[PDB]
């Protein structure tokens, strides 16, 4: 990363190989770098336990003339993450079609053996992976840019809650200020 703002832009391009992966992330809302500093991750970091479903909203930011279908899936934990769209499609997923409605919501359900998981997540408390693949491809007419960006938003659902108040690892000091 050269430019910080690039971190928010998921690349999507024309003539992508069939069934190509767009991204992959591991579900540790309070621990993984992808989530730890978001609103949700920051709140989680003042607690030690969490439980509930999450909303991952994806918004397509290309021109009105571009088209595409993407498969976004959630894989409950297991020994191995999905390496192929064929692997991914066996789990919880939604097939997103681009049109007037620019955004799509993948709602990752609370599927766990325990009622709560740890914010400082471990293997026992593993939550799984979220991956995205090209369902068809991003097709474009003449005179439009060749690649575009997709953005991802995250928030908690109404069945979400946190427990066990604790101090956050994200702030410190060596001296009194002044």
């Amino acid at each position: 990363t050269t430019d910080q703002m690039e971190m928010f832009r998921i690349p999507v391009t024309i003539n992508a190989p069939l069934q190509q992966q767009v991204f992959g992330l591991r579900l540790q809302p309070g621990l993984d770098s992808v989530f730890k500093h978001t609103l949700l991750g920051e709140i989680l970091n003042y607690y030690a336990h969490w439980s509930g479903s999450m909303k991952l909203t994806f918004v397509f930011c290309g021109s009105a003339m571009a088209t595409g279908k993407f498969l976004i899936a959630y894989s409950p934990p297991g020994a191995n993450p999905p390496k192929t769209r064929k692997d991914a499609m066996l789990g919880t997923h939604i097939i997103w079609d681009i049109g007037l409605q620019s955004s799509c919501v993948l709602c990752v359900p609370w599927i766990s053996q325990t009622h709560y998981r740890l914010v400082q997540q471990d293997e026992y408390t593993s939550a799984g992976y979220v991956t995205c693949w090209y369902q068809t491809g991003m097709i474009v007419p003449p005179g439009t840019p060749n690649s575009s960006s997709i953005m991802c938003f995250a928030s908690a659902c109404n069945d979400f809650s946190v427990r066990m108040l604790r101090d956050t690892p994200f702030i410190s000091q060596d001296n009194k200020l002044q």
Partner: protein, 252 residues
């Protein structure tokens, strides 16, 4: 609008913002085998959500010079998860399908595809009298292609598009369940095929119940756009799948 469409089978959902209608077999919705139509006496398995869900085959490219493609069923799905597994462990099987062919372009592209399901699409050899092998017509989810020129290779099927490999007029394929994807209005086609056969159930490896053909009747064309090929993707979901005669799995 009615153009909006949402379909959910098992753990998969398909959505379309620009569709035509949904063609249903010969007006017949898929259904499980009734007691008064059965011969095989063993209690069948009906895996339900594990098999009756959407499977997306490998995509293909529609280019200005493309001529047409075909996929034979159930062969095309023989490797798809538990649907394929159940096909292997059972002597008999039965199923209907929801076929969803996807193809998006732009308001400046033009082209038109016929999406048909031909029951018993028995084909002729490239050289009359010369037998060909199964590999000349189906192999997993591999798309097979028709040609403009008449086929010379005797290991192949007679692929000349205008006779659709069956010795009939390609413009008459419309008597079979079909839908058109005219780039100007559609973006997908959905056909629900019920189980059609002369016997109540059948072996799923040995008999290709129907063949899906996607044929460009009006060539893909466009102007100075940076996009070149237009992908075509086929997603299909078995419906009311039931199997009989469990035993060891068939090696292939």
């Amino acid at each position: 609008s009615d153009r909006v469409r949402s379909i959910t089978l098992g753990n998969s959902t398909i959505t379309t913002q620009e569709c035509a209608n949904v063609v249903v077999g010969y007006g017949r919705w898929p259904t499980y085998l009734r007691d008064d139509e059965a011969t095989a006496e063993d209690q069948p398995t009906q895996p339900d959500v594990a098999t009756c869900r959407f499977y997306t085959l490998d995509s293909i490219k529609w280019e200005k010079g493309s001529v047409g493609w075909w996929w034979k069923f159930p062969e095309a799905l023989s490797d798809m998860g538990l649907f394929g597994q159940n096909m292997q462990y059972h002597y008999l099987g039965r199923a209907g399908y929801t076929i969803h062919v996807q193809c998006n372009a732009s308001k400046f592209h033009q082209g038109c595809l016929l999406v048909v399901c031909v029951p018993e699409a028995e084909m002729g050899g490239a050289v009359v009298g010369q037998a060909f092998s199964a590999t000349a017509m189906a192999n997993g989810d591999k798309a097979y292609e028709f040609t403009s020129a008449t086929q010379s290779d005797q290991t192949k099927v007679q692929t000349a598009i205008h006779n659709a490999g069956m010795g009939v007029g390609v413009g008459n394929l419309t008597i079979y369940p079909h839908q058109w994807i005219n780039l100007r209005t559609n973006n997908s086609a959905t056909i629900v095929m019920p189980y059609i056969n002369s016997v109540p159930m059948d072996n799923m490896f040995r008999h290709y119940n129907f063949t899906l053909m996607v044929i460009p009747f009006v060539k893909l064309d466009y102007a100075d756009t940076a996009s070149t090929y237009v992908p075509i993707t086929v997603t299909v979901a078995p419906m009311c799948a039931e199997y009989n005669g469990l035993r060891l799995a068939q090696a292939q």
